[PDB]
């Protein structure tokens, strides 16, 4: 529908976000995902911490360097949920994956580009009220991720600039509405009402 | 089958690999925490043994 879709991970549930992201790439839609630190997983923090430690013990006994690799960053926990939903040892699969990008925070390009959401993976739409859940960033710091603070700091900075932007814009569309209303009631506008506009 | 007698392993797995270093000048992997209330100063120094 658009050349590149930018997804605001915040408030999405990992494997449901993954399931849709994977399909899209396979079908040829480039996807970039931001604020993976604000991803969720159902299940209380402790549960998913225990799960993560299960993962953590699997290693190649003769050489741990060849063994399963354990990435600690929310973006990359995420990639993992994703990568495992893609026939990723096939050309067709590598190709789909090159179509993907994932970030903690919203770094340049994407901070001035619109981001969407994916309602069929929106936690607030899916999880029954009262069911505990985990935030990706908090899970990740506990298994080694080093950059929650730095991301938080940048994000607060970015969030201030974006508040300005918004404000300016909302000021501007107020003017624009003031304009659109002198033109209301005019002849060309009554005609357009007639045609559903 | 199970050792027989127990004894500590030989040597420390946290100093692997036992390869030659990438340089004669060992790297400083960490500097003292910063306390910006004190005057500005170096935090290390070169010399020859």
């Amino acid at each position: 529908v658009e050349p590149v879709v930018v997804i605001d991970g915040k408030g999405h549930l990992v494997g449901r976000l993954a399931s849709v992201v994977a399909k899209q790439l396979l079908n040829g839609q480039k996807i970039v995902v931001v604020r993976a630190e604000e991803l969720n997983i159902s299940g209380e923090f402790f549960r998913n911490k225990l799960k993560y430690h299960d993962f953590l013990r699997k290693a190649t006994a003769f050489n741990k360097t060849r063994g399963p690799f354990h990435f600690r960053a929310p973006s990359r926990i995420f990639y993992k949920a994703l990568r495992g939903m893609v026939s990723h040892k096939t050309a067709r699969g590598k190709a789909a994956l090159e179509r993907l990008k994932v970030f903690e925070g919203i770094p340049p390009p994407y901070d001035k580009k619109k981001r969407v959401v994916v309602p069929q993976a929106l936690r607030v739409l899916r999880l029954k009220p009262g069911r505990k859940y985990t935030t990706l960033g908090k899970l990740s710091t506990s298994v080694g991720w080093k950059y929650e603070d730095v991301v938080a700091k940048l994000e607060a900075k970015r969030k201030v600039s974006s508040a300005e932007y918004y404000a300016k814009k909302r000021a501007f569309t107020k003017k624009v509405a003031s304009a659109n209303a002198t033109a209301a009631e005019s002849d060309v506008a009554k005609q357009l009402a007639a045609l559903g506009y | 089958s199970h050792r027989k007698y127990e004894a500590p392993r030989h040597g420390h797995l946290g100093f692997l690999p036992r390869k030659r270093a990438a340089s004669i000048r060992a790297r400083v992997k960490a500097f003292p925490k910063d306390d910006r209330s004190k005057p500005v100063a170096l935090t290390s120094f070169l010399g020859y043994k």
Partner: protein, 172 residues
């Protein structure tokens, strides 16, 4: 077993010279179709009478429709069923708009709570509870209070495209 119709079924043991005009017995039966219905009939007659289908005959089979299908009714429901380790009688109450609707949710309920498949259940009686206050089970009494109202918090709308440009709102 499905979406139920209710049937009157009438049978009798076959006539004989010395006994022409045998007695004629009736059952109401909840089934998805008349084939299952005549089957169920023979199933219960044999738990009650010296008969079986080879020596009996179906006299009539007719669907009974609800008298007042758009009138809300409080049903009393009486069931026999088997569990994994014994067999048990039960009384339940179901609020709906037809016996037929009511019996569907019963099997559903029996399957969900007690894990009883259809084979394991005998409906003993389904009867409309005429006076509120002969209503016994509180999960229904609840819906009889005067001027009753309730909101439906946390509204969740079905998206029709995979992407959305807003950020939904569960207001309602």
């Amino acid at each position: 077993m499905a979406h139920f119709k209710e049937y009157q079924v009438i049978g009798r043991r076959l006539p004989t010279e010395s006994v022409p005009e045998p007695k004629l017995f009736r059952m109401r039966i909840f089934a998805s179709n008349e084939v299952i219905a005549k089957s169920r009939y023979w199933y219960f007659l044999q738990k009650l009478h010296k008969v079986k289908k080879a020596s009996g005959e179906i006299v009539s089979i007719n669907q009974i429709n609800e008298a007042h299908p758009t009138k809300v009714k409080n049903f009393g429901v009486w069931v026999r069923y088997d569990s994994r380790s014994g067999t048990h009688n039960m009384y339940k109450e179901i609020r709906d708009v037809s016996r037929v609707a009511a019996v569907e949710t019963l099997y559903q309920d029996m399957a969900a709570r007690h894990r009883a498949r259809f084979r394991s259940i005998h409906i003993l009686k389904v009867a409309e509870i005429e006076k509120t206050a002969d209503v016994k089970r509180q999960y229904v009494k609840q819906f009889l209070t005067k001027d009753l109202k309730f909101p439906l918090p946390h509204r969740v709308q079905k998206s029709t495209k995979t992407f959305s440009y807003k950020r939904p709102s569960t207001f309602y």
